[PDB]
Structure formats: C-alpha cells, structure tokens
Amino acid sequence: LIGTRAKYGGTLKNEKGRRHIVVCGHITYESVSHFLKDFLHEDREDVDVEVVFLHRKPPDLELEGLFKRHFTTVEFFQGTIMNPIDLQRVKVHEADACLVLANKYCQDPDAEDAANIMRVISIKNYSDDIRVIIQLMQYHNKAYLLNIPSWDWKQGDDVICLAELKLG
Amino acid sequence: FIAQSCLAPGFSTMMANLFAMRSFKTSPDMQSWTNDYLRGTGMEMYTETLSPTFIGIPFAQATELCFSKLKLLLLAIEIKSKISINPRGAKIQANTQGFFIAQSADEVKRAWFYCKAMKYDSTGMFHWSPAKSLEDCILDRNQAAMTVLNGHVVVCLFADPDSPLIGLRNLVMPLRASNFHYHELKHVVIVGSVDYIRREWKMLQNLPKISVLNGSPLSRADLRAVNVNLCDMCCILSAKVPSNDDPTLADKEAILASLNIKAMTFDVYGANVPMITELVNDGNVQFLDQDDDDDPDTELYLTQPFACGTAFAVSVLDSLMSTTYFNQNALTLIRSLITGGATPELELILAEGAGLRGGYSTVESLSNRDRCRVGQISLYDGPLAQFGECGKYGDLFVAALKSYGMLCIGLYRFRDTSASSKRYVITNPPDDFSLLPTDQVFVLMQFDPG
Amino acid sequence: STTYFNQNALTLIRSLITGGATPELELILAEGAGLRGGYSTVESLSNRDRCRVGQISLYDGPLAQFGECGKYGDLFVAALKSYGMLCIGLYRFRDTSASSKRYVITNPPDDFSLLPTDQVFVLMQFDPG
Ligand SMILES: [Ca+2]
Ligand SMILES: [Ca+2]
Ligand SMILES: [Mg+2]
C-alpha cells in the first residue's frame, strides 16, 4: 500500500501565442535524447517550439534529468493517447502536430504497426484537423492509414515508412 | 439482434433498451434528439393480466384501446400455452396475460382495473435446401463481379483458422424464416477465411442463398467485388481471441474495417453504407464515430453510435438475468422475436447432431407461416405517407393498425433535420408526437400469402 | 524533425530514392490488386523525362581531363553546361599510395583538387534512345 506514487499529472496550461507539438509512442532515454539533439540544433532556424511528451510509463532517473536540462523547452506528462482525457490535458487540439515514434527494435513489427495506427485513429477521433507524423515498420500497413477518412496528405499528414526508405 | 437489424436498421438498439431498467428524467440543457432518445430508453417490458372488459373483443381492437385510453402499448398476448405477437383475429379470453411496453410497472397497472365508467424444415418455420456443398458456394473475384448482388447482406468476418466457433447459423436462420417469401429473401455473402467457414458449414448446408468469398474484409477489392454500396446491411464480426495485451487494441480490425468502408467511393458514398459493428470492448465505441464528443465514463447505451444502431456489444445483455428470473415468458417473447421462431421441438432436432432436417409441406405446416415479422416502413410515399406531413404519431398508429394490421413500435428519425445521414431510435413515442416526412417507423407486419 | 519543419523535404527524399512514387500510385497499390499496367500514350511517355542518380568516372571521356589535378568547380560548370549533369559529391579512394576502399565526400568546395581515380555522384538527364 505505501509503495505507490503518482509523480506526473495535470493539464498543460501556458500563455497564448507560442506553439507546441506532442510526441508519443516509443519514449525511452535514447529515443528522446536522439530526437531532442536533432530537433534543438544550432544549424536549424531559431523558432520557439515547445516539445511535449506523453507516455503511460513513469520515466526513470536518467530520463528525468534529461527533462530538467530542457526545462524551458521540454515537458513530460503521464498518460496514453487512447484516453480522450489525456488528450485534452496536453492540449492536442491546439498543437501544431503530433509525432508518433515507433519501436524499431521490436520482435513483432506487425504488432508495433497496429498499435501505432490505433494511436492515429485516437488522435484523429479527438480532432480531425491535426497534423500527424508516424513511423511505420512495414509498407503494407500504410494502406490502413490511407483508408482513414480524416487522413489527408495535402494538409500535412505524413507517413515515414522505415522499410520503404531503408530498402530505397 | 444483428440479423434482425438487417431487416430493420436500428432494431438492435430498441431491443437492447427495452430490457434494461432505466429511469428517465427530463433535462432541458441538452439537444432535443437526445431528450427524445432518452425518453425511449425509459421504456421497459412488463406483463399484466387484461381486464375482464377486454374479454370478447379481438386483439386489434384491444391494443388500439390501450394505446388511446390507457396510453399503453400492447404487442403480445398469451393464448392457452403459446405466445403470439400481434395476432390478427385473436379474441381476448378470460385471464389473458398481456405484454406491455411502459415507463414503469405502475403504468401497466391501469390495464388490470378498467371498465366502461422438402421446401421447409420439420417445423415448417424456416426455408430449406438440399444440403449444398461448400465448394458450390465459394466465389472468386472474377465470378463475384459478374453476379449482381442487390439488397443483399454482407457479413465481414475476422477469424483465424483455429478461432473458436461462433454461431453463424444463429445469424442466417432469422433471415431464412418461413415468414418471408422466397423471392423476398436476402442473399447472404460471407467474406472471410474458408478454413474457418469450413468448420461451420455443417449448420449452413440446408440454408438457401448463401455465398462464400475467400479474402479479407479490409481489402477494397473484395468489398467492391460484392457491391457493398448496394447491400442492405454490412456486419463486421470478429471471432479472433483477444490478446488481452491492451483493451484499446482489442478491436483494431473492427474499427479499421468500419473506417475503411466509410471512406470508400463508388462510380456512391461510403458513409451511406449501412453497417453494424459488434464490439469486444465497450470503450472502443468512441472510435466508431468522429462527429461526437467522447467521454470514457459514459454508459454504452448513451453513446451516439449505439443510439444510431451502428454499434452493439454483449455487455447490454446482462439484464436478461433479472428479466428472465422475474418472468420466464419474457425470455420466450425475445427468442420468438429475434430468432424468427425457434420452438422447443427445433431444439431437440438440432441437438441430435444431424443438422437441420427438412419436411414435406402439408396443411398443418403451411399454417405456421402466418405470423408477424419485424420490418420498417417509410413515409416517403404510399397511403401512409400523408401522416408524415406534420402529422401525429397516434393518428398513424390507429390508421395503420386498422387497415394493414401493422403495429408501430417506434421511430427511426434523422439526427439533424437542417447534414448527416444518421438516424437514431425513439422507442414508443407519445400519441401527440409530431411526425416528419423523413421519419421511418418500426412495424410488426402480418404475413400476406402471395 | 526534418519532415515536421518542412513537408516538402520528405517529398524530395521519396522522389529521389524510390524512383518516383506519385500519390496516385499509393491508392492503386493500396487496393490490393498489385501493380496495374497501362497502355503507353503521349502523356505517359513524357513522365520518363526526369533526372536519375548515377556515377561517372574520370578515367576516360570528355570529362577525364578534369581529373589531372583539376578543380571541382571547373568540373561542375563544364558538366552542367554540356551534358546537364549536376555534381553532388565525390567517391574517392581512402588511400592513394593499397586498399580498394572509397569514402564519400559530400559537396566539396569549388577549389577542391581532383584526382584521376575519383568518382563523381551526378544527376543525369534522360536521353531518349
Ligand atoms: Ca423506466
Ligand atoms: Ca468519437
Ligand atoms: Mg429500458
């Protein structure tokens, strides 16, 4: 009974005017550090965009220290995309885009792709007008995303298929 | 429930709400369609003994009197026993048990005190076929295209070759009842793995007009090969065992199939294809529809997809424990209303293991075909169309009952009248309800020989 | 990060490594009938006129004279004007004094000194015939 704790929670509340994005999917220490190094780089044009992470597992000690070093730019919340309550907390309807990271080193690529596709359905269910960028392990699963009525490549929706790009 | 929805869309929602104890409280701070729908959910199913004043008069005069004077809907009676649903020319006898639809058991008390002040099976209740083989029904893309399937029923099945068997027989027989003429039967096309359908073909040999297509319902080529745009109802069924890894991942295929068809276009609209999807998880109903606000704590019967009849689950059938215990005849009425008529003799014949057994048509068997059936009518055209021009529900109920012997149960009305082609279910609207020309009526229609 | 900051960036990569995959090809393949052929017409044959990725060697040819201790900028201008070739980088021997291993130099300066054994990444136009 005493060995429990709820460290992360609460809704995202900040000022108006600035823009932010939501990152979900495979959130580990090296998944965030590699993403943040490329996202926040000197060569990139200086634009103030906030990065919000949403994962159902509590981060370990090393990941929490990484968030502290990016306190003014990176924030973390505990929750899942499939829950509409958690979607409102991180303010999905006002974010520029939602980025879904895939577990490249997965035993079953079919299982990983199916879970990622369901996240896009949940995101589009909350709001039809939202940019979604997703990693797909296999090309034949790209057909399912294209069949979504709210999916629209002309509006910024993009699919980055690792299998197509790697063999290309 | 799914099979009856093919004959009348939205019927599963009305049946599910009729056997769940719900207290209805009016609320002004919500949409009018929501208030109208919630009024129907308050209706339940009750049994009461008819007053001695009703003795002698036929059923048609009896149910009309209850609707007008007593504001109660009488749809079935017990004859010395047997249960008959909307019987024509059936005089009310002494101590006759009546089946009523009302807000509460206090309302039906008014019905007790009142005064002036081989073509078919052995039972002859289902159509029969001379045990056609599976290979004679398997269809390919090339030969399914040349076949013109109009007004048919498409069964989208997700099942592995070793998936646990589901009662596909329980889905086809209600569509093959003898109460339907052979020309008005609906062709059934099952899209799925024959390695699974082969295990269940034993119970489907003697059912006419059944087609099988090897493939996947998620493929647009297979759906176009069976003319999903022309079908009367598309059923998405999943027989695969849940992996229990995550409840939100239990209905990935069912949700994807629904979204796939909804976005298809034909040379005409994918969203116009009538579909009903059974959900393993109640919480996955939020993904079925996009133009609604999803709340994870809301009851399933309160959700928009369920109110429109496009969603179903087994979690709405727990209340049948209480319903059956308090009245055994209540369960008999449900089975005789959704299965197309399954007498206890049919139980022993099927339990032997030889499958459905046919019988030679005689005088006593053909009399069994004369029973009421579930259907829908539209006020667009016909003699009853003049009631849709801002008429009253009570006026339509009386006229239809006297002329065609039709019993109106509820309405299937557009959610928005100013749009989306989505219709919700209103169960037993008041006699003062205002009708619309676009409304559809759930009716119990008598059998017409010829 | 590349796709988020610019959607056109991902489109350029896909059109450069997949040989050209237009959004119409996405829907045809997603149906499930496989690759579908088409009868050659006037409008289709115009699609074949696009640049492609290839390599050239300074061992022999009109461009071989730039490999004799020449400059990368001189090779870039001459190839662009004559054959319409765009030089992206060099594929040069790791050791020039051995092992047959070559590394990649991306966008060398115009003052870069070339070698007769160097190979050039180029974007070559379509020549009908
Ligand atoms: Ca009630
Ligand atoms: Ca929804
Ligand atoms: Mg109820």
Tab-separated table of N, CA and C in Angstrom, chain A residues 56 80 82-85 111 114-115 117-118 121-122 124-126 144-150, chain B residues 218 220 246 248-249 251-252 255-256 259-260 262-263 286-292 294-296:
chain	number	residue	atom	x	y	z
A	56	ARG	N	2.728	6.426	-21.034
A	56	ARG	CA	1.989	5.812	-19.939
A	56	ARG	C	2.886	5.276	-18.831
A	80	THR	N	-1.915	8.242	-21.786
A	80	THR	CA	-1.938	7.488	-23.032
A	80	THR	C	-2.748	8.240	-24.077
A	82	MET	N	-4.736	6.878	-26.312
A	82	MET	CA	-6.048	6.261	-26.461
A	82	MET	C	-7.087	6.817	-25.496
A	83	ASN	N	-6.670	7.517	-24.444
A	83	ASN	CA	-7.596	8.106	-23.486
A	83	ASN	C	-7.915	9.533	-23.903
A	84	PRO	N	-9.175	9.853	-24.208
A	84	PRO	CA	-9.506	11.241	-24.576
A	84	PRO	C	-9.244	12.240	-23.464
A	85	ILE	N	-9.274	11.803	-22.203
A	85	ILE	CA	-8.987	12.710	-21.094
A	85	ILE	C	-7.542	13.187	-21.155
A	111	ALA	N	2.710	-6.181	-34.783
A	111	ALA	CA	2.097	-5.704	-33.548
A	111	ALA	C	2.428	-4.238	-33.297
A	114	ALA	N	0.375	-1.991	-35.708
A	114	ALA	CA	-1.043	-1.937	-35.365
A	114	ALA	C	-1.296	-0.991	-34.198
A	115	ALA	N	-0.427	-1.022	-33.185
A	115	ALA	CA	-0.583	-0.117	-32.051
A	115	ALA	C	-0.405	1.336	-32.472
A	117	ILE	N	-0.934	2.636	-35.464
A	117	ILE	CA	-2.065	3.052	-36.289
A	117	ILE	C	-3.257	3.414	-35.413
A	118	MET	N	-3.485	2.642	-34.347
A	118	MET	CA	-4.595	2.935	-33.445
A	118	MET	C	-4.409	4.273	-32.742
A	121	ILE	N	-5.728	6.897	-35.062
A	121	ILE	CA	-7.187	6.888	-35.030
A	121	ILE	C	-7.696	7.645	-33.810
A	122	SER	N	-7.075	7.416	-32.650
A	122	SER	CA	-7.477	8.126	-31.440
A	122	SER	C	-7.221	9.624	-31.563
A	124	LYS	N	-7.041	11.400	-34.391
A	124	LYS	CA	-7.987	11.945	-35.357
A	124	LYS	C	-9.410	11.947	-34.816
A	125	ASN	N	-9.740	10.996	-33.937
A	125	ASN	CA	-11.061	10.990	-33.319
A	125	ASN	C	-11.273	12.230	-32.460
A	126	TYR	N	-10.254	12.620	-31.690
A	126	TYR	CA	-10.362	13.819	-30.866
A	126	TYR	C	-10.500	15.070	-31.725
A	144	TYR	N	-3.751	0.976	-44.522
A	144	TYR	CA	-4.748	1.199	-43.480
A	144	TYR	C	-4.855	2.676	-43.124
A	145	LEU	N	-3.715	3.361	-43.018
A	145	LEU	CA	-3.731	4.783	-42.688
A	145	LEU	C	-4.381	5.604	-43.794
A	146	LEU	N	-4.120	5.249	-45.055
A	146	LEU	CA	-4.702	5.992	-46.169
A	146	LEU	C	-6.214	5.821	-46.235
A	147	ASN	N	-6.741	4.728	-45.685
A	147	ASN	CA	-8.179	4.493	-45.687
A	147	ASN	C	-8.909	5.259	-44.593
A	148	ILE	N	-8.186	5.931	-43.702
A	148	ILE	CA	-8.847	6.737	-42.670
A	148	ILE	C	-9.518	7.936	-43.329
A	149	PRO	N	-10.803	8.192	-43.068
A	149	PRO	CA	-11.471	9.329	-43.724
A	149	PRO	C	-10.849	10.676	-43.402
A	150	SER	N	-10.316	10.855	-42.194
A	150	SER	CA	-9.747	12.133	-41.790
A	150	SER	C	-8.286	12.296	-42.190
B	218	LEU	N	-10.920	-6.208	-44.999
B	218	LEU	CA	-10.142	-4.977	-45.036
B	218	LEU	C	-9.657	-4.623	-46.436
B	220	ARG	N	-10.118	-3.486	-50.217
B	220	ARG	CA	-11.106	-2.755	-51.004
B	220	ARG	C	-11.544	-3.544	-52.232
B	246	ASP	N	-3.901	-5.111	-24.443
B	246	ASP	CA	-4.426	-3.786	-24.176
B	246	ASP	C	-5.884	-3.771	-24.615
B	248	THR	N	-7.681	-1.298	-25.572
B	248	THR	CA	-7.864	-0.423	-26.723
B	248	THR	C	-7.414	-1.074	-28.025
B	249	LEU	N	-6.630	-2.149	-27.951
B	249	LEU	CA	-6.171	-2.874	-29.128
B	249	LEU	C	-7.006	-4.116	-29.412
B	251	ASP	N	-10.123	-4.213	-30.645
B	251	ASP	CA	-10.980	-4.024	-31.811
B	251	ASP	C	-10.280	-3.222	-32.905
B	252	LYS	N	-9.002	-3.515	-33.150
B	252	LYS	CA	-8.278	-2.820	-34.211
B	252	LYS	C	-8.861	-3.147	-35.580
B	255	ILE	N	-12.554	-1.691	-35.988
B	255	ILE	CA	-12.565	-0.246	-36.195
B	255	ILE	C	-11.997	0.101	-37.566
B	256	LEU	N	-10.900	-0.551	-37.957
B	256	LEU	CA	-10.293	-0.272	-39.255
B	256	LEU	C	-11.236	-0.623	-40.398
B	259	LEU	N	-13.897	2.082	-40.654
B	259	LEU	CA	-13.351	3.300	-41.244
B	259	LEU	C	-13.018	3.102	-42.717
B	260	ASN	N	-12.566	1.902	-43.089
B	260	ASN	CA	-12.229	1.633	-44.482
B	260	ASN	C	-13.450	1.781	-45.382
B	262	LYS	N	-16.227	3.346	-44.695
B	262	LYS	CA	-16.823	4.673	-44.587
B	262	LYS	C	-16.151	5.678	-45.517
B	263	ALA	N	-14.906	5.421	-45.915
B	263	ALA	CA	-14.182	6.328	-46.794
B	263	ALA	C	-14.164	5.877	-48.249
B	286	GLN	N	-15.947	4.779	-28.904
B	286	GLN	CA	-15.616	6.177	-29.157
B	286	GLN	C	-14.992	6.374	-30.532
B	287	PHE	N	-14.289	5.363	-31.044
B	287	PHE	CA	-13.609	5.480	-32.328
B	287	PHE	C	-14.515	5.188	-33.516
B	288	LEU	N	-15.718	4.658	-33.285
B	288	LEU	CA	-16.607	4.326	-34.395
B	288	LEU	C	-17.065	5.575	-35.137
B	289	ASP	N	-17.385	6.640	-34.407
B	289	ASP	CA	-17.868	7.880	-34.994
B	289	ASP	C	-16.924	9.021	-34.643
B	290	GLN	N	-16.836	9.998	-35.546
B	290	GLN	CA	-15.922	11.121	-35.380
B	290	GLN	C	-16.615	12.418	-34.991
B	291	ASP	N	-17.877	12.601	-35.372
B	291	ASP	CA	-18.594	13.848	-35.101
B	291	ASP	C	-19.365	13.762	-33.782
B	292	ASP	N	-18.636	13.444	-32.716
B	292	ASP	CA	-19.221	13.372	-31.386
B	292	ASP	C	-18.133	13.608	-30.350
B	294	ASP	N	-16.395	12.319	-27.067
B	294	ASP	CA	-16.219	11.039	-26.395
B	294	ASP	C	-15.858	11.244	-24.931
B	295	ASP	N	-16.523	10.493	-24.056
B	295	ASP	CA	-16.248	10.514	-22.624
B	295	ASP	C	-16.100	9.069	-22.169
B	296	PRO	N	-14.938	8.671	-21.639
B	296	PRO	CA	-14.720	7.251	-21.310
B	296	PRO	C	-15.651	6.700	-20.241
